[PDB]
């Protein structure tokens, strides 16, 4: 032990020597982690005791103890610490603070025993995340960052690159499992870092297991980022197996606190090490400690009680091989070489933080007094912890020191990379991590531009993306072709009527509209027939007007021929008017004229038959004109006057009409959708007028002393009966998806024309060449 | 300290003295919990050291220490325990076991320090449930049951009575809160113990808060069981406030480990204490310890180092009031009184269990050797704990001692009750709890038969019970009256057709069936008319058969009167046949006869008119008979031969018919549901036969040299036309919910009868009185 005297004595623990399996500490004196830390703590104390404005007139002393890398051995030392609480007796000293427990195993139960006695310790090389809970180590603190502040950094550098799908290797131990658990715990918080697999390697791998794990990694090829937490030999063996397995250019390694910047894990694996995101703890070097340690001799340091063994093992001298007492008076380079240990910037920080806490304590309790105080003759653990956990200052290497509520210092890492460069090896810094992510993506080279490890490639408008369940990371796209529009990016809902989905990138384009018009394959026949019919009717009217006084006319034509000719003309007017496009007016007049024409014709013939029969068994010319012009015509004139068949133009626009399935093509109609029942009622009224004339022509089939006109009346009525009987089933041939406007319209117009021709051609059109 | 020497030395801790607020233990020496336990441990040790078959040749020694009811003070003693691990030096002794830490606060951190050094302790008066986890007190054990083994008992006695709804009071401390949390944790596991409220009282109640809490308990009146966890004064004040508030006979108190059997919590509250389920720890008394403690003097016990103070405070003597050296040589009853402390049966048990564990250890490691062993010269903590936690033996008062995996002894409680008995007070045992529930419900008296605290009273068939959400304890019942049947206890689904829910306890009773039958208010008219009609027709046929040769007959009747009379008879046959119940056959023949009758009549009249007209402008009698019997009758004979109107009997059973809402009453019909369109077609055919006869009667309205029969033919046809024109809207008066079988049937039968009478009464029925 090193019993330095002081007004405020604070102790320490260091890993000097090693675990002695023989029941006694086996002589090692590692002297890299043991000596370089006692000397650093004593250097820090000597510097603090020589600063006029750090602790003022107060001085410090240190009781240093030696943990032999074991826990149970450290227990007796920890007990020795608390000896002022329980015959030339020596008054024992009261410890106010312990700096030690470098190994994380010693830290745990040393923290237990010290928290049972209210002593705030500040560890320097204990990074296990399990010491970050104020329920079993409430008095613990650490200047070194915990291992759970690195995984978060990884997440950041995972996110800032763009990756959303990674693997997670994990060695068997306390380091790898805790690191991977921390990474998974931070994963769920923000998402977007979906982990595909989670492998697990044993401490002692049985022959032939590495290939199995690597092929397990080859389950999902889309996960090309491996976030490893393993040891040097594990990294080497994984990389060698990957190289042998001929699966290069497929993996993007993500380092940890164990890959660092060493060239040892890849000696022949330089080819299969391209890409590294290894995260290493920020380092530094203390010139003052070097100037102290290199200027010590065997008669300048009696404080240290293990310095003879260090003067022996550093020079081979055994005092009492070579029995050389002095040799390297300067131990810098005379014998062997000097290499300041890495974790020498965290014991000076602990000592300085304790001193700063004590100084802050002295400035508040009893200000205005130099030296020791009646309110400061016994330090309290709770107050000292409160002052420790509120320090902010710049220490060695200009690094701020601060603690959280638990007492965990913030992390400060650097990030490296590994890639070929003109057949060589080089770990350039590609950024750092000090409370945030700092990157140098311009100085990055994945020897591919920028690779990625995203689960699902971005989707494309036209095929709907659905997010899978359990992990919002792998969206599956499914095609929803059909009669439907994409309301939003994903959902493709029903596309409204009159709006037909198209073949463009996205759209619902208007359905083309069709309708029979003047020029058409099924349009020449009725217009040709109708023009020929009006030519014939004009020829007939020319014959009748060129000779009217002639007695051949006096058999008719007094008041009947005018009406009958008007009806025959209106029938051809119907023939021309049915087929025209029913935009606004064409379909309005349709029913009115359709009635009136054949009404004139058939009512005239009916009254002619009735009057010839009655005179055979009031034929005055104006009387006959009155009884013809208003017998059945007035009925339809009143029907037109109060619209029953002629509704206001429906113009039912046929967006649907025949609902064409698989709407790659469809049709729309501009028909005037007056119901077929209107055709039924008009036809029925006309046939009702026809029935009486046909019957009364049947009855007088043979009549003497009568003109030759009486028989053709019957012949025309018979022919019209036949043509209408043939017509009506063709009307009942509608309601077929084939042609709703090509069958019915041609049928009706041809029937009308043929009836007009029969009534004309066979009745009074002949026997005119004579006149 | 008491330094007894032995081969295996095991130490102890006891509550001697009390907490000294002055920074020095204030002299109390309670001597009930301090002295009676050192003497008990030393008695146990002396007995074990005098048993030839417990530890054989090995002997035991004890180092006793004094915790002054504090934790921090106990720390120095605990450190003193471990002194063989760290100038006339004395070799120190190695402790193999610690019995102590009676106070639950000392137990915690003493367990911490001892588990840091692998020493198995066995506590005896520490019941806090927080010491039952093998993650911070892995080396702890206790012979006294934990406080979490009582709540479960309560649950059992809550369940075995039948209660499913209780309140939960909880004092402010470690006892009440832990007990209530344990009760709630056991509550969710099995359910059926739904807790209504959870109150909370402060350590120092502000004036006027007790009434507030008691009225909070009066929120839900259905929760009449109060499971209390409080302190003596809290129980007293709650009961006094309840008494004052005039809310007696409404609460069923449930005690705890703090109500016991004391008469102090209810001095004037005897009236408002009726009912108690107080659970107290099973007790006992040790005669050997009494014989030891009462036989000690001031010169018989130098072992104890606090026995002078006990000889002083137990007798007032101050040595050096009254300066009396000896006084009560026997301290049993000479001065003051003796009362063995309650927790004296749990230190002897701890010592005996440790001794048994050591004995078991000596029987397995190196058997066949008497004394100490080279394999037993250093006890191991893990093995000793394994042997401690596997002991089974009968100790003092015949109580088995055994530990769980944690090291918690099973609980053994007794249960009391408190009720008036002839104006007195008495705590009879009503059962016990030793690993199960044992009750004496026959010896229970709630001074009500057996009360209950169930949330919802049991429901009743007819009104469906629905379980509320969050707690399956308070079922709400809702009435589902209507057209629905209870498939199971709760759900009342749709009751099937033809099956009408009833007013019985539960059922769906068949709907009554109705149909017009022979006797009915709307049935006398048609049968009366029809019988009178057949009487008239018989009179007429008598007239015609009594005189046939008479020339008055020779105007008709050659081949026409027979057919016409047959038709008139069949019309009245229809009149009788329509109203009969259409069970199997009645509706089958209905259409056939309905046709045939009026067919005969009207076809006969039609052929008569046609033949009289034709002879006025082939009247051979057999020729006329042939042209009448087959003119229109053969048509219906072929129609009957190939059934078109007469379908196979439908007999559509009218389960629904008019679907009567609010089915407290309804109707069912047995109608033969031949569609009305069959009536339409029969009527249409008959009218078609009628039309020609009516027209040809119209045409010959006036005919010379013809018999007087020619005009009544026309008159009857006119009257029948009128009656049918009046009839058809009455047919179109159907499809009304009022009367589907009372309107149409009477209408049809009366129309048939009137038509028959008109054709008969006005045509050939007159002009017969002459003949």
UniProtKB/Swiss-Prot annotation, chains A, B:
Give GO cellular component annotations, separated by semicolons.
plasma membrane
- Respond yes or no to whether keyword Transmembrane is given for this record: yes
Q: Where in the cell is it found?
A: Cell membrane
Gene Ontology molecular function:
G protein-coupled receptor activity; glutamate receptor activity; group III metabotropic glutamate receptor activity
Pfam families according to UniProt: 7tm_3, ANF_receptor, NCD3G
Q: Give the disulfide map.
A: 26-68, 194-473, 317-326, 366-373, 455-474, 459-477, 480-492, 495-508
Q: Which domain of life does this protein belong to?
A: Eukaryota
Q: Which InterPro entries match?
A: ANF_lig-bd_rcpt, GPCR_3, GPCR_3_9-Cys_dom, GPCR_3_9-Cys_sf, GPCR_3_C, GPCR_3_CS, GPCR_3_mGluR8, GPCR_3_mtglu_rcpt
Give me the Extracellular side stretches, as residue ranges. Answer: 1-522, 581-586, 647-676, 734-748
Q: Which stretches face the Cytoplasmic side? A: 548-559, 608-625, 699-711
Where do glycans attach?
Answer: 57, 246, 394, 422, 504
User: How is this protein positioned relative to the membrane?
Assistant: Multi-pass membrane protein
Gene Ontology biological process terms, A to Z: adenylate cyclase-inhibiting G protein-coupled glutamate receptor signaling pathway; adenylate cyclase-inhibiting G protein-coupled receptor signaling pathway; G protein-coupled glutamate receptor signaling pathway; regulation of synaptic transmission, glutamatergic; visual perception
Q: Could you tell me the keywords of this UniProt record?
A: Cell membrane, Disulfide bond, G-protein coupled receptor, Glycoprotein, Isopeptide bond, Membrane, Receptor, Sensory transduction, Signal, Transducer, Transmembrane, Transmembrane helix, Ubl conjugation
Residues passing through the membrane, by range: 523-547, 560-580, 587-607, 626-646, 677-698, 712-733, 749-771
Q: What residues bind L-glutamate, as annotated? A: 104, 125-127, 175, 257, 343
Q: What does this protein do?
A: G-protein coupled receptor for glutamate. Ligand binding causes a conformation change that triggers signaling via guanine nucleotide-binding proteins (G proteins) and modulates the activity of down-stream effectors, such as adenylate cyclase. Signaling inhibits adenylate cyclase activity.
Task: Give the family per the record.
Answer: Belongs to the G-protein coupled receptor 3 family.
Subunit info here reads: Interacts with PICK1.
Which PANTHER family does UniProt cross-reference here?
Answer: METABOTROPIC GLUTAMATE RECEPTOR
What name does this protein carry? Metabotropic glutamate receptor 8
| Species the sequence originates in | Homo sapiens
Per the record, the gene is: GRM8
């Amino acid at each position: 032990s090193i019993r330095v005297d002081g007004d405020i004595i604070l102790g320490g623990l260091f890993p000097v020597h090693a675990k002695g399996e023989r029941g006694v500490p086996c002589g090692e004196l590692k002297k890299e982690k043991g000596i370089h830390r006692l000397e650093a703590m004593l250097y820090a104390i000597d510097q603090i005791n020589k600063d006029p404005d750090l602790l003022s007139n107060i001085t410090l002393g240190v009781r240093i103890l030696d943990t032999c890398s074991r826990d149970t051995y450290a227990l007796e030392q920890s007990l020795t610490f608390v000896q002022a609480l329980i015959p030339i007796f020596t008054k024992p000293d009261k410890i106010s603070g312990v700096i030690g427990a470098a190994a994380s195993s010693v830290s745990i139960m040393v923290a237990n025993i010290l928290r049972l006695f209210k002593i705030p310790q500040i560890s320097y090389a204990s990074t296990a995340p399990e010491l970050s809970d104020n329920t079993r180590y409430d008095f613990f603190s650490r200047v070194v960052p915990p291992d759970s502040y690195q995984a978060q950094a990884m997440v950041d550098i995972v996110t800032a690159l763009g990756w959303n799908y990674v693997s997670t290797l994990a060695s068997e131990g306390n380091y790898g499992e805790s690191g991977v658990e921390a990474f998974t715990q931070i994963s769920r918080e923000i998402g977007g870092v979906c982990i595909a697999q989670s492998q697990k390697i044993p401490r002692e791998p049985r022959p032939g297991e590495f290939e199995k794990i690597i092929k397990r990694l080859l389950e999902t090829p889309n996960a090309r980022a491996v976030i490893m937490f393993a040891n040097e030999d594990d990294i080497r063996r994984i990389l060698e197996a990957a190289k042998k397995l001929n699966q290069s250019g497929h993996f993007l390694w993500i380092g940890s606190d164990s890959w660092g910047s060493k060239i040892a894990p890849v000696y022949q694996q330089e080819e299969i090490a391209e890409g590294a995101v290894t995260i290493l703890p920020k380092r530094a070097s203390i010139d003052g400690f070097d100037r102290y340690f290199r200027s010590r001799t065997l008669a300048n340091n009696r404080r240290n009680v293990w310095f003879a063994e260090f003067w022996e093992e550093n020079f081979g001298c055994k005092l009492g091989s070579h029995i050389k007492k002095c040799t390297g008076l300067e131990r810098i380079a005379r014998d062997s070489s000097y290499e300041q240990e890495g974790k020498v910037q965290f014991v000076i920080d602990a000592v300085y933080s304790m001193a700063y806490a004590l100084h802050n304590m002295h400035k508040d309790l009893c200000p205005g007094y130099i030296g020791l105080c009646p309110r400061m003759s016994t330090i309290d653990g709770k107050e000292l912890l409160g002052y420790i956990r509120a320090v902010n200052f710049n220490g060695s290497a200009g690094t701020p020191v601060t603690f959280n509520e638990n007492g965990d210092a913030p992390g400060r890492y650097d990030i490296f990379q590994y890639q070929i460069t003109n057949k060589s090896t080089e770990y350039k810094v590609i950024g750092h991590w000090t409370n945030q992510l700092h990157l140098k993506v311009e100085d990055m080279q994945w020897a591919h531009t920028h690779p990625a490890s995203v689960c699902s490639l971005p989707c494309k408008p036209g095929e709907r993306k659905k997010t899978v369940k359990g992990v919002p990371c792998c969206w599956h796209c499914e095609r929803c072709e059909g009669y439907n529009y994409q309301v939003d990016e994903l959902s493709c809902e029903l596309c409204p009527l009159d709006q037909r989905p198209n073949m463009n990138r996205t759209g619902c384009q208007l359905i083309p509209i069709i309708k029979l018009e003047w020029h058409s394959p099924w349009a020449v026949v009725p217009v040709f027939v109708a023009i020929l019919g009006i030519i014939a009717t004009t020829f007939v009217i020319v014959t009748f007007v060129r000779y009217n006084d002639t007695p051949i006319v006096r058999a008719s034509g007094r008041e009947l021929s005018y009406v009958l000719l008007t009806g025959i003309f209106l029938c051809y007017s119907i023939t021309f008017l049915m087929i025209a496009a029913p935009d606004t007016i064409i379909c309005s007049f349709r029913r009115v004229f359709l009635g009136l024409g054949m009404c004139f014709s058939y009512a005239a013939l009916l009254t002619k038959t009735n009057r010839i029969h009655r005179i055979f068994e009031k034929f005055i010319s104006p009387a006959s004109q009155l009884v013809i012009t208003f017998s059945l015509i007035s009925v339809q004139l009143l029907g037109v006057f109060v619209w029953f068949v002629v509704d206001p133009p429906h113009i039912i626009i046929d967006y649907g009409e025949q609902r064409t399935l698989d709407p790659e093509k469809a049709r729309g109609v501009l028909k005037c959708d007056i119901s077929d029942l209107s055709l039924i009622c008009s036809l029925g009224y006309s046939i009702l007028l026809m029935v009486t004339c046909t019957v009364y022509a049947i009855k007088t089939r043979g009549v003497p002393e009568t003109f030759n006109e009486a028989k053709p009346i019957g012949f025309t009525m018979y022919t019209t009966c036949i043509i209408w009987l043939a017509f009506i089933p063709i009307f009942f041939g509608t309601a077929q998806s084939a042609e709703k406007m090509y069958i019915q319209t041609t049928t009706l117009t041809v029937s009308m024309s043929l009836s007009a021709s029969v009534s004309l051609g066979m009745l009074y059109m002949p026997k005119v060449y004579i006149i």
